Design a protein around this nucleic acid. Structure first.
Lengths: 217, 45, 99, 146
RNA sequence: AGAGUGUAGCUUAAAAGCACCCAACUUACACUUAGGAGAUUCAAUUGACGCUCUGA
């Protein structure tokens, strides 16, 4: 009973920035803030304004404004980080700083002799070794950089079956911490791809069953 | 999926105002923190 | 010995005469009711979405496990158990503005 | 009656296991049941430390409702006292005058009993995928004293 | 290309009973109260629009 030994290596990248906000959530936050204001009582700023103005009027008939002005000036002078990062490039799709709002999966294009499709970076395992060890070895060899792929568990994800001699594919995921990719100008077609781009790039059924267990958000 | 725990509310009965203040860490990132005194910038070394 | 912290301080009982009144209107109440209904519907939709995604992930994991069991009666013993690696696991939250 | 066919019909303590034990000071945690083809870890300890209190409380409520709806037993969830921290502020033209600020820091703790490999990995990936802004996760062990 | 099928997540239910979420109490879970969204895919026991399996 011959069985060809293959695998798979899907990359998991945590998002940096949050998803955009909807108007109904804005109205909900506004009404929650109004309820918080109506429920709050005896605050430091409220007193430091009210009793201070009362003392001012009393000693005039016989702080806070400058402080909030300085606060507004310091807020206007300090410019926060520009969140506009997915629209100023629109070309460098294989960059780490491309998408920072959702999850990104990495895949490498490889043209074989009988097959000419865009398969996820597989992982060949040997009977003399384990499975996760061979998977992480193949992930380290196909990445040619210094990365920290923290696996979320020894259990697999999804399996398939294709014959012509039997074969099998073992999917494995690992959480990525930092991104120290050396030499981003390699000839390997490793592009950071999210969800919609992933569903648009693939074509056969062996890849259409991958978007069912990935974090769709 | 980061908005499920964003719209919050203080369930306590007696409390003061918690203005949405911003704070920058030792790298460059702001965060909305509900804290009194309507400050704008917190330079934490 | 755990120290209780939810106890309100002593400065929460001497002062309580600032904003005792609350004035609204019928339009504000009906708008708040409509917004709460819409938010409840949105939360129910998100809960159903999470439920179906979790069910899909679980059935995919079960299919992968049963295929690995029927294709290899040895790798399951080393794939089901977890090696000591996620003991000091940590994941810091996302950010608002990039560095 | 003992001889009648209706014997043992009013029995009810055999269907319950709560023997009213002293669970306030008992430090008997379940060990990680290792076997190979059936992995089962003991009790963990999830930490949600942040600067805001209401965010941590909401996240704790959400994760508790999630683990209640996912059919997994929960030990006990408590909270530790906050730690006040001062933020020194040096003057611009004067490198000798230092000021001080006040900020809060809270943290919540939740525990789950049964965590099989697939179920625990799905739970942790769902937690990290729906991780809100501000808080941070740092799972430790059950031997964390106060 | 063939087969299994057919009431929302479930029914040896015929438009109901179980489920879900939000608002009030709770460190927290939870009861309770106050509310919300849900279905017989089509033309008269028949044939075809949706899912799965067996293939190439």
């Amino acid at each position: 009973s011959p069985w060809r030994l293959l695998g798979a290596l899907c990359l998991q990248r945590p998002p940096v920035v949050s998803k955009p906000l909807t108007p109904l959530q804005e109205e909900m936050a506004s009404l929650l803030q109004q309820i918080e204001i109506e429920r709050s009582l005896y605050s430091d700023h409220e007193l430091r304004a009210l009793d201070e103005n009362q003392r001012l009027a009393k000693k005039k008939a016989d702080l806070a404004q400058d402080l909030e002005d300085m606060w507004e000036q310091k807020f206007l002078q300090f410019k926060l980080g520009a969140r506009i990062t997915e629209a100023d490039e629109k070309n460098d799709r294989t960059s780490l700083n491309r998408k920072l709002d959702r999850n990104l999966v990495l895949l490498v294009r490889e043209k074989f002799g009988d097959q000419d499709v865009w398969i996820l970076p597989q992982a060949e395992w040997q009977p003399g070794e384990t499975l996760r060890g061979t998977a992480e070895r193949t992930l380290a060899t196909l990445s040619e950089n210094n990365m920290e792929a923290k696996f979320l568990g020894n259990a697999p994800c999804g399996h398939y079956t294709f014959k012509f001699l039997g074969a099998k594919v073992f999917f494995f995921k690992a959480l990525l911490l930092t991104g120290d990719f050396s030499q981003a100008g390699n000839k390997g077609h490793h592009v950071w791809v999210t969800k919609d781009e992933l569903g648009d790039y693939l074509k056969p059924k062996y890849l259409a069953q991958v978007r069912r267990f990935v974090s769709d958000l | 999926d980061s908005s499920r725990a964003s719209l919050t509310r203080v369930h306590r009965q007696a409390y003061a105002r918690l203005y949405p203040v911003l704070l920058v860490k030792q790298d460059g990132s702001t965060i909305h923190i509900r804290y009194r005194e309507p400050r704008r910038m917190l330079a934490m070394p | 010995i755990p120290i209780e912290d939810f106890i309100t301080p002593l400065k929460f009982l001497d002062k309580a005469r600032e904003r005792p009144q609350v004035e609204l209107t019928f339009e504000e109440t009906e708008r708040r009711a409509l917004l709460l209904k819409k938010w409840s519907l949105y939360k129910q939709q998100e809960r159903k979405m999470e439920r179906d995604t979790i069910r899909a992930m679980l059935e995919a994991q079960q299919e992968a496990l049963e295929e690995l069991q029927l294709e290899s009666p040895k790798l399951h013993a080393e794939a089901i158990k977890r090696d000591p690696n996620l003991f000091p696991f940590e994941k810091e939250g996302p950010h608002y503005t990039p560095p | 009656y003992k001889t009648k066919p209706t014997h043992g019909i009013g029995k009810y303590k055999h269907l319950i296991k709560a023997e009213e034990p002293k669970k306030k000071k008992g430090k008997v945690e379940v060990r990680a049941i290792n076997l190979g083809t059936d992995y089962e870890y003991g009790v963990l300890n999830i930490h949600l430390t942040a600067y805001d209190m209401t965010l941590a409380e909401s996240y704790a409520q959400y994760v508790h409702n999630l683990c209640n709806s996912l059919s997994i037993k929960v030990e006990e969830s408590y909270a530790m006292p906050t730690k006040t921290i001062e933020v020194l502020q040096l003057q611009d033209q004067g490198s000798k005058m230092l000021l001080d600020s006040v900020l809060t820091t809270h943290e919540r703790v939740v525990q789950i009993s049964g965590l099989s490999a697939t179920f625990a990995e799905i739970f942790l990936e769902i937690i990290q995928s729906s991780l809100p802004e501000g808080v941070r996760l740092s799972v430790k062990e059950h031997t964390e004293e106060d």
